Design a binder for this molecule. Structure first.
Ligand SMILES: CC(=O)N[C@H]1[C@@H](OP(=O)(O)OP(=O)(O)OC[C@H]2O[C@@H](n3ccc(=O)[nH]c3=O)[C@H](O)[C@@H]2O)O[C@H](CO)[C@@H](O)[C@@H]1O
Ligand SMILES: CC(=O)N[C@H]1[C@@H](OP(=O)(O)OP(=O)(O)OC[C@H]2O[C@@H](n3ccc(=O)[nH]c3=O)[C@H](O)[C@@H]2O)O[C@H](CO)[C@@H](O)[C@@H]1O
Ligand SMILES: CC(=O)N[C@H]1[C@@H](OP(=O)(O)OP(=O)(O)OC[C@H]2O[C@@H](n3ccc(=O)[nH]c3=O)[C@H](O)[C@@H]2O)O[C@H](CO)[C@@H](O)[C@@H]1O
Ligand SMILES: [Cl-]
Ligand SMILES: [Cl-]
Ligand SMILES: [Cl-]
Ligand SMILES: [Cl-]
Ligand SMILES: [Cl-]
Ligand SMILES: [Cl-]
Ligand SMILES: [Cl-]
Ligand SMILES: [Cl-]
Ligand SMILES: [Cl-]
Ligand SMILES: [Cl-]
Ligand SMILES: [Mg+2]
Ligand SMILES: [Mn+2]
Ligand SMILES: [Mn+2]
Ligand SMILES: [Mn+2]
Ligand SMILES: [Mn+2]
Ligand SMILES: [Mn+2]
Ligand SMILES: [Mn+2]
Ligand SMILES: [Mn+2]
Lengths: 316, 314, 310
């Protein structure tokens, strides 16, 4: 049994993929103690990506899917079924591991009996920032969702204990183009107790290059996961987690400032209708846990009142 | 010889503390024989302590015990009103104190000015202010002398006004019923006096749906609009508008909309507020201070989001 | 056929009317090339105004209406019927012309085949953007801020008015001047701006209104000049901005107006704007986004709030 399976979906990466693969093959961890599983989402780039992957045959595991699934969910699911390792680690095909990543995160996980180990993110190139608050206290052996700001760091680019994923049948959902990764991490968090944060190096380097129907169905599943948590079973604790998530959603959600945007009126109405429908399935008891500057915006969404959202946004 | 003044004092589980309040009444500059203290005990159950105190003034006070606890001052004060045949009554709460000159100074001033109502300045151990800023006022006015801001019943009232108009404390509300008594009295009389030479009444400080509260507020507006004294309809609008301003400034839970109250309770509160103000003619709104323009409209529209916004813009 | 008819409605002006009439009669333009048409709206000032007009017997054309119409519309329509000139110029009876006004505006119009010539306004006592660039031979409604200078105190080519039967509306005591100018603009192509002097000196001492505004949007959307649907959206949206910036009772919502009157006003406003395509909304200045939506939604509270945030 391997200590770690790195699961990397690929799609039309071509020759750029060498760099990412090299970052995985040059780990300080013993080569026999881990594997890289590459799942190619039926690249169509005149054989370029597949030709790159074939240069590592015998050093990696590899499967190609019959048709392109359109995002990381199915390829990542395919990888989970292939791994019988202790931990998995999701790596995107454009990012880079620090050479110490697998060894340090695994060791720290083992030491602290962690279900989830989060390594500090670095960045290559201007663009999207990476989470910062989660890493501001240094290393944390047993982290808290709320105190360590985990709802602001919900990518799957982390080390997850495989047995939690297996026992709880946790899979990536395939019906939405956005927030699926948040849902997977939340489902994991709600079924596990022990989370660790490792900050000694920048272990994972992020490289930078709708009507809301599907999106708000995904958000609905996040709230459902919280309210069914077997770990966080106290009802008031669920309200608190749900309120903290609502705060995160209002702070960083898709099209968060749609109301005063250049979106067509008809599209605003449909967007807000979906948003309102989803939030109205969340108990109002969670609302007292939302940061209070958002009190009006949140009520306006509940009331499905576009004028009131517009006004709330002018006052924020 | 009818008494000049009946002091009406409800009691409930005061204990030894009560001596001080009784003594403040029994030591007056007014001739002892010209006033009486009527004590109505609201079924104390403090191991006989309150009753033992009252028993020490047997023969110096009139006393009635109620056989079940009413739960507030209304039923005891009404009992007191039935018992008094005096020219004026004065409501004293069982934890407060009268200045030794209170009955004589207020009664004499009332007699000199043919006053229906005399208001003595309040002091505090551990109260309204604008009403008392102008010195003594022989013939005061509700709006000009800020009387809507001093509506407690801890005042001297002419008994004939209470009797003729059958004015009683309501017992359907645990809040604002005192304001209603004073409003009903003001709406049925003309001559009000303010006396400030001394802190005549000393307040001792110690360490919901809206259904009843707003039922009481409803009765205040109905008193104004049915006044046999203030009969002119524009004067009614002015008084109602001035009351509305007082309510928005100092009313219960005035900032409910952005508060920590549960949503269902906000909706019930505002439904109550909205339906009550919507019975008040919009002609009164021009008399409300302009800063409240949006908040008052939002309340009339029964629109919680608008009330939230109005409060954020204030 | 005269070059210019100056059309001047009068009503209870009195002795001060002398100063105005002589500003017309002392033009640099050849005396026989222009005419002053005075239309008295049945003055009732004990003959004072009439007595002034009478002194110019033989130097002006004059018609008195049998009854006071209440405003300039009917008298101006009367003036239009009486004039067979190349151009008309509307002059209010309390205002003044610069001696160079008719000559300079006409020559500039003739030079540039203008349908409309706008002279720079001056003031006596206690629109600007249109004049800030100096003379413009062929102006653009949007770029030269014409929607902000919609008075009829300008030189208009008579044939345009005749051929399109353009008349002042009598059923609105407000905004009828705007509608005239807009109907003219939407049925003509060549507009000129002249700025060498302050040519025209202004002296300073909802059912019908929104019916008029409705006609403004209809004039734009049925324009035989501006036939492209997107251009029509652009013009409508720019007009919406002008309406929100300078419209009658623009701040009605937080005003001392009776609630019932606020509701009726907004209801008319809402009804009118909801006949205007939402495609026009993107061309409205972004600060008005909330106010404009509040009006479309017929939501008085939202209009009150919108005003407080402007
Ligand atoms: C800043 C941010 O929000 N980043 C997120 C974004 O990254 P980002 O926008 O960089 O997504 P990438 O392009 O890196 O794609 C993510 C992974 O999906 C694979 N892929 C892509 C297309 C396809 O049809 N099939 C397929 O398997 C890629 O090869 C890659 O391994 O989306 C990723 C996928 O949810 C998340 O992990 C990242 O956290
Ligand atoms: C700052 C303020 O808002 N003060 C008011 C408040 O005073 P406060 O909160 O101090 O009320 P008190 O405790 O004085 O009680 C009022 C009177 O009611 C009596 N009592 C109490 C309980 C009971 O079951 N039965 C009974 O008769 C008390 O003995 C006392 O005589 O409420 C009083 C009663 O409306 C008003 O007169 C005061 O103006
Ligand atoms: C600053 C401003 O917005 N000024 C406008 C305002 O001028 P203002 O408010 O100054 O109106 P005036 O007093 O100039 O009257 C306009 C003209 O109408 C005539 N009149 C008046 C009363 C009457 O019953 N019948 C009649 O024909 C006047 O004599 C005058 O010739 O209204 C005029 C007519 O809409 C517009 O041309 C002006 O641009
Ligand atoms: Cl993250
Ligand atoms: Cl999101
Ligand atoms: Cl005395
Ligand atoms: Cl008064
Ligand atoms: Cl008081
Ligand atoms: Cl209540
Ligand atoms: Cl009256
Ligand atoms: Cl109150
Ligand atoms: Cl007043
Ligand atoms: Cl206007
Ligand atoms: Mg004595
Ligand atoms: Mn990436
Ligand atoms: Mn990329
Ligand atoms: Mn609303
Ligand atoms: Mn008390
Ligand atoms: Mn007390
Ligand atoms: Mn004028
Ligand atoms: Mn004038």
């Amino acid at each position: 049994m391997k200590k770690v399976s790195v699961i990397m979906p690929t799609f039309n990466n071509g020759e750029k993929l060498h760099r990412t693969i090299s970052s995985v093959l040059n780990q300080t961890m013993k080569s026999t103690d881990y594997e890289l599983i590459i799942i190619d989402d039926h690249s169509n780039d005149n054989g370029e990506t597949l030709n790159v992957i074939k240069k590592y045959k015998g050093l990696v595991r590899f499967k190609q899917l019959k048709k392109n699934s359109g995002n990381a969910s199915v390829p990542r699911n395919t990888g989970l079924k292939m791994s019988k390792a202790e931990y998995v680690f999701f790596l995107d095909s454009d990012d880079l591991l620090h050479e110490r990543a697998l060894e340090d995160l695994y060791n720290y996980g083992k030491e602290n009996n962690s279900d989830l180990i989060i390594g500090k993110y670095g960045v290559e190139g201007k663009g999207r920032s990476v989470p910062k608050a989660i890493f501001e206290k240094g290393n944390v052996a047993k982290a808290d969702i709320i105190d360590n700001s985990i709802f602001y760091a919900l990518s799957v680019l982390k080390m997850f204990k495989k047995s939690v994923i297996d026992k709880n049948k946790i899979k990536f959902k395939t019906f939405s183009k956005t927030a699926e990764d948040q849902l997977f991490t939340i489902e994991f968090l709600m079924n596990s107790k022990n989370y660790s944060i490792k900050t000694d190096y920048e272990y994972y380097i992020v490289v930078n290059d709708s009507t809301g129907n599907q999106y708000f169905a995904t958000i609905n599943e996040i709230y459902k996961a919280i309210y069914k948590s077997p770990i966080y079973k106290n009802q008031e604790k669920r309200h608190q987690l749900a309120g903290k998530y609502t705060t995160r959603l209002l702070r960083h959600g898709q099209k968060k400032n749609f109301a005063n945007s250049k979106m067509k009126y008809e599209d605003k109405i449909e967007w807000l209708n979906n948003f309102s429908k989803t939030i109205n399935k969340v108990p109002r008891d969670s609302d007292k846990y939302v940061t209070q500057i958002f009190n009006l915006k949140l009520e306006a969404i509940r009331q499905n009142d576009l004028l009131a959202v517009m006004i709330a946004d002018k006052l924020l």
